[PDB]
């Protein structure tokens, strides 16, 4: 019987700071136990200071990204070149996803950019368009390995103030871009160690009010 | 999920947890399971995260159009019936929703409707909905009186979600609390179970099953 879905592996990760946000993903693409490519990007600049990744079944991921990019194009055409805010992108993507509720896109979607007050924002979606804004999200194959690390290191979960008798939590605070890139790089090397579908390369898109910058790092190729 | 809503002397209490699960994987601890449809209308979410979220924000748009066309706020009965008639059209397609439509109008008074994806629509004073509904019911039912003070009602609702959050593996995160009156809904905060459990254990002396 023909199975219209496949699984291309990889994993993605979004972190939001005070005046920036990052969207990272490995560059490995796989099916079963074979590597298809060691460098096939899956995080994209979509215009209007929005970056997007839709990880899982790549064909669905590409279709969705294409549709959203196109949605941004027509938003300009129809509303006098107005900037598509991250909250508006998120809601639009919900409708893109839920429109295929009964034949879903098999992807975990994350977008990152800046909210309307210039603060860093990360939005994540389930495959049929449930969504939520967060400081923090890992998605894809190694999500279960990385996400609890992020709860601990980004949101300081289960961490208390020493000598306060486990009564005063470690206080929340925004991270510098330098600190965030450190957590991203460590998250991915750890994920690469223990997950076979993660490796080869890491591409990070950083989003500030001056635009979108990229950084790339080698990952273990086994 | 665990969600509840009950009518009493001083209006309606609405309380929900904030956990989303995919199997045993805890997907989120920060889901907003109450949707604020208008200043006098609330909807609760349980079941499919997308199904609930999508159709309940769609419901808000339909309620807005009613008041533009009719120069009047929509009745709880009519708002709940839009949602129930919608999901009934999809019956068999596999939508998964257990929702409560909670609100006040002058013609109705404070009103709660339970609406689910099999197309069941019920008016009632007390409902608990979700995988943790039975746990919430156990506490809620055994302390419920029509005459609870607003203060006690808020706590009982909060305590009932806590009960379910503790015992039900698929409920947790935090409690979100609302009070609905003749003047509309009032938010009564987000309460992390992380700290709320220990606070309640200490102050109330309950949860003796747990290593203190």
């Amino acid at each position: 019987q023909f199975n219209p879905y496949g699984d291309n592996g990889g994993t993605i990760l979004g972190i939001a700071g005070e005046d920036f946000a990052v969207l990272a993903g490995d560059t490995r693409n796989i099916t079963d136990y074979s590597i298809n490519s060691r460098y096939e990007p899956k995080v994209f600049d979509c215009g209007d200071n929005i970056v997007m990744s839709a990880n899982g079944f790549a064909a669905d991921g590409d279709a969705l990204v294409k549709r959203f990019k196109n949605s941004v194009k027509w938003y300009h055409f129809d509303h006098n070149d107005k900037k598509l805010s991250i909250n508006s992108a998120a809601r639009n993507i919900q409708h893109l996803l839920y429109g295929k509720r009964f034949f879903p896109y098999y992807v975990h979607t994350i977008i990152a950019g800046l909210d309307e007050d210039g603060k860093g924002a990360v939005y994540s979606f389930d495959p049929v368009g449930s969504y939520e804004r967060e400081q923090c999200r890992a998605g894809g194959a190694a999500a279960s390995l990385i996400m609890p690390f992020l709860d601990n290191q980004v949101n300081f979960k289960n961490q208390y103030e020493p000598g306060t008798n486990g009564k005063v939590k470690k206080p929340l605070k925004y991270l510098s871009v330098e600190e965030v890139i450190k957590l991203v790089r460590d998250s991915f090397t750890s994920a690469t160690e223990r997950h076979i579908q993660v490796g080869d390369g890491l591409e990070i898109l950083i989003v500030t009010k001056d635009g979108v910058r990229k950084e790339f790092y080698e990952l273990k190729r086994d | 999920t665990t969600t509840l809503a009950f009518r009493f002397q001083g209006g309606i209490i609405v309380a929900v947890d904030s956990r989303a699960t995919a199997g045993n994987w805890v997907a989120s601890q920060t889901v907003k399971k109450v949707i604020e449809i208008n200043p006098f209308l609330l909807g609760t979410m349980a079941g499919g995260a997308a199904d609930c979220q999508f159709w309940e924000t769609w419901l808000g748009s339909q309620c807005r159009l009613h008041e533009l066309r009719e120069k009047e706020r929509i009745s709880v009965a009519a708002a709940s019936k839009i949602l129930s008639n919608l999901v009934y059209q999809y019956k068999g397609a596999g939508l998964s929703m257990g929702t409560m439509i909670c609100g006040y109008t002058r013609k109705e008074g404070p009103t709660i409707y339970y609406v689910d994806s099999d197309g069941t629509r019920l008016k009632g004073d007390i409902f608990c909905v979700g995988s943790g509904q039975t746990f919430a019911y156990g506490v809620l039912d055994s302390n419920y009186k029509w005459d609870l003070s607003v203060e006690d009602a808020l706590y009982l609702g909060k305590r009932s979600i806590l009960a379910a959050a503790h015992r039900d593996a698929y409920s947790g995160g935090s409690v979100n609390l609302y009070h609905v009156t003749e003047d509309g809904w009032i938010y009564h905060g987000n309460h992390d179970v992380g700290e709320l459990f220990w606070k309640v254990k200490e102050e109330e002396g309950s949860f003796n099953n747990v290593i203190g």
Partner: peptide
Amino acid sequence: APAX
């Protein structure tokens, strides 16, 4: 699809 995750549930609640």
